[model samples]
Target: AEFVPPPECPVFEPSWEEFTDPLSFIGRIRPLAEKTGICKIRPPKDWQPPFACEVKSFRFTPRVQRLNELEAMTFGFEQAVREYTLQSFGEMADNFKSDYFNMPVHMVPTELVEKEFWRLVSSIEEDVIVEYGADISSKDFGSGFPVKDGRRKILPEEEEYALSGWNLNNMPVLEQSVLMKVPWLYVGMCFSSFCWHIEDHWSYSINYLHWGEPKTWYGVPSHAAEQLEEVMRELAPELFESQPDLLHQLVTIMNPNVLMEHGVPVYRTNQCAGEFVVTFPRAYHSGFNQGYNFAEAVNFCT
Candidate 1:
């Protein structure tokens, strides 16, 4: 009855001086952690960047999520995100309200959050659950109507002009986040799982757990994607059928042991607050919240 965890992925604790540059630092640890597919990074203790979510009137429809363990999978990263999201907006604009800070709907009771989170993830599988998963990286991703911006009182006399962290000083791109453009903010409760998927099928991923109960994860290295794919097809044929490329069908969530038994090198990690989890390019990963929490994750490329 015991379910043993896969081997621990690497965790890096970089010094202030060594961590001066994100890309340089990743390059330094590339050899050790990259092979494992996913690794953790603990920033220098003093590296706290405030945080960037103070939209007092912010709102977005929490799209219904379906967790099909045997099935399934955006984004111009940004443009395409707007596309999928606009559809819901047209339909559910009045669905959410009263959440002012960037961590949408996280102000509710923990037990209430936990119970509902479990209901959706349980075997009975309640399907219409919604969580705040908004893109918060660029200006457009937030409030597209801060029009008073050209017109709000010097931004209401704020402090900390910037709070975004880590992704800066990295490699160049089309000037983009992961699938490669904007960072996404996720507010989650116990058992709220983001199912299996890689970053746009090719982008590297770095997840930051701002504050929360530890979120557990299972990851697969890039090289074994096909091996993982075949095992998946055998076990969950419905998800892989007719798709020339499987990156977008990220809805599957099988046990880690299944991947291991099939010779796919799966790895596991329990990501706690203030730590970073980096997914190497083309790696597969999925996990759930062990408790109520908030996390910001974005995609990257090199």
Candidate 2:
């Protein structure tokens, strides 16, 4: 009973004008959202963009990860995501949801997870297993930004859906290229997760949860990035070499409870279906799925 979580991240609701243009809106809110390294956008209720995808048709294997170190990444355990086939994996996740909701070793009390997440980090071996799939080739799944695909017939409604600023497909992959233009499509299961990383070099990242259980995020603003690094390093000095080249690459899902114990400013929030979570330039963010969910994302910057 000795755990307290971080503060909540900002929730931004833009008016129709602000909502009309995606890039300008993103730029407009950068400063404020940047303060927390992330921001949640709940577009008008009526602004539902139609969704198209075959749950059964899409198939790809998700990579799994075992949690390692202290003060680095987590959620009771971030399970990431999938395949062989999503439909079956989904049912498997549903079973997990059933058990979690009903209560058991999986009930995952917040304070318990908070304590557990770090306890494992501190000589803690959560067996922290997480599953995730990366790199969604643009041709098959398509771009999150409205792209000018000359090959396909355009629906009237989708034609106007084009907001050029958010489009990433056309950006050159040459010299100035963060060419992260090829987006990532991830299917999130009960505890599928991502932790503490930045989009290609302070580049902006946007995620849309097409459907399913909400995603919880713990974000540390850019300003605190280095501060967070310093704090985590000291906690696990053994992780870093005493001094030399080859020092400097590490991770530890330090419990946020301890993050507060270390003077880091962390923010938390939930991103639900149809909503967007835009991660700022250098924020360190991490979190897990509340249950079964499907999500798609893209990274782009000129």
Candidate 3:
């Protein structure tokens, strides 16, 4: 199959000067938002997350086609939750352990897999539903970067406590610091998606793909947040009218092309293994996995 080109999104390489003050740096990049909602940051060669832990025991259930195909179907409040409850957790657990983890699902084109995804969901009226990664301990995986002391020295003695010192995951305030508690692991197969939404408290989020295939993303800048919401409401008025808190529940999903057609500035990118995708505060973003992959993400406030 021919490789389908990914949609264009802004990419940035920050220097030492830009790294000194993150908040100010972001403010400076706000103008770029008019062209692209999200910007991919390619850090310096020396800046890389160390992968030094065994994650085989970490497991998560892949959402069935019906539940994951948020853009294709709609369900009532009670019905959605009820259908979700009827799904068998044990079945997904077995599948994850037996087949998915052992095999990489990126052999075929992501476009074809996405087509098959809608077909599977459209064919069935009732289907399985499941959710995972609500709570995971960050301490379990350990820090992938070095920690600095008050004296600014990296020491072996401080290695164990080093995880908290990493600025990307740590936020000083108690309320905002909740995201640092547990680094969530996302295991996705073809068609599994994270719907359109912003992070809790409109904080910045950084996601790192530990291993496996790429994950595609679409992002809208913080400035156009209202425009995206208006487009969603206009296209799916029933959803917005019935459930005013639909976006907050993370149940809303849509195609970026549709957004672009409606004059919403949406940018796209495919995040491969060993790379990082940082979302600015209140930047609405969404995406799906191309195939099987493992990712860890945390939200932080500056």
Candidate 4:
């Protein structure tokens, strides 16, 4: 028999009018999420994430003043964060086997930024594990990512040149709005690894597979979510209170050997070339970045 790949996701080249309507936009994905507990959509086989469509690409430009203002509102508080420690795996009992904490990047404050930066520099001088984790004082397993006191520590610097909040109202420079280019080529792959995590932000995301096959397993706020929490407390009490609510949403598939087997009925889906995934809020889901040599995508959330 000829090799027949599984059903690839649907593709949509929505018009400007179609794309603008929130209802119209969501109509394309809502069904997928409801049926198999996931929403996998894509463009033509040769498309990538950064591009909106072949005939025309899309770019968003923020006004310089607005950008600066947004910078102030968000990045102004660029201070080193106070680290957190892992007491037990309470919140993470569902899937995530590893213990890590909220990054210090989220807790930056203008006043403390300078002091925190210097402190981080000092910690580095003292041979501390300063980059990926927060706790600089102590470790849990002596090797793996551990907690410090009771929280993850933060670094006191700014790295990415992304936008923040306070600058939305500013007007953009028309004709020459912030511009970026997208090309038509096989960009990347999709996988089942790193599946089932929730980003606290509210927005829409589209992931594309350039040259490989990937699978996704998703779960929403069904009895599964409620049941998982109850079972966790009874089964692993110590691991339940680590971070309370934050860790519960994370579906850790970072490790290949470990399977996230919880009561939640995770709906699974697979895709090949020309396939991609989309997501919305309150819809807890996870998947892997697997398949061919490369893949690419574009994610925009508001």
Candidate 1: tens digits of C-alpha lDDT, residues 97-141? 123222444454433433444344434533333343534543434
Model 2: per-residue Cα lDDT over 1-302, one tens digit each: 44466788989888776887677787788889989998899887776654434443667777675545333432555564445566776776777556644764345454444444444444443455545445556467554445556744456676554433333343322336374346567776655556556655567777778777777788889999888877766764573535432234324455676676788898988788888898887778787676667777766553
Task: Give the clash total for candidate 2.
Answer: 15
True-structure RMSD, every candidate: 8.4, 5.4, 7.0, 20.2
Assess the local accuracy of residue 175 in candidate 2 as a C-alpha lDDT between 0 and 100.
34
Model 4 lDDT at residue 148: 22
User: In model 3, what are the clashing residue pairs, if there are any?
Assistant: none
Task: Name model 2 segments beyond 4 Å from true.
Answer: 67-82, 103-130, 142-155, 162-180, 237-250
lDDT of 4: 0.32
The per-residue C-alpha lDDT of model 2 at residue 174 equals: 36
For every model shown, the clashing-pair count is: 6, 15, 0, 36
When sorted by lDDT, best at the front, the candidate numbers are 2, 1, 3, 4
> Candidate 3 residues 1-302, lDDT tens each?
23323366776667766755545665677687435657666555555555533443333333343443443454443232211111243344335433533543334555655544444433455453434332244455433333333433456644543453334444333453354355555656455677788877787777777666677888887878888888877776474545654444466666566677777777778787766677877788887776556676777556
Tell me each candidate's TM-score: 0.69, 0.76, 0.67, 0.38
- Where does candidate 3 stray beyond 4 Å? 1-7, 15-30, 33-35, 54-56, 59-167, 171-182, 237-240, 246-248
**lDDT of the candidates, in the order given:** 0.60, 0.64, 0.58, 0.32
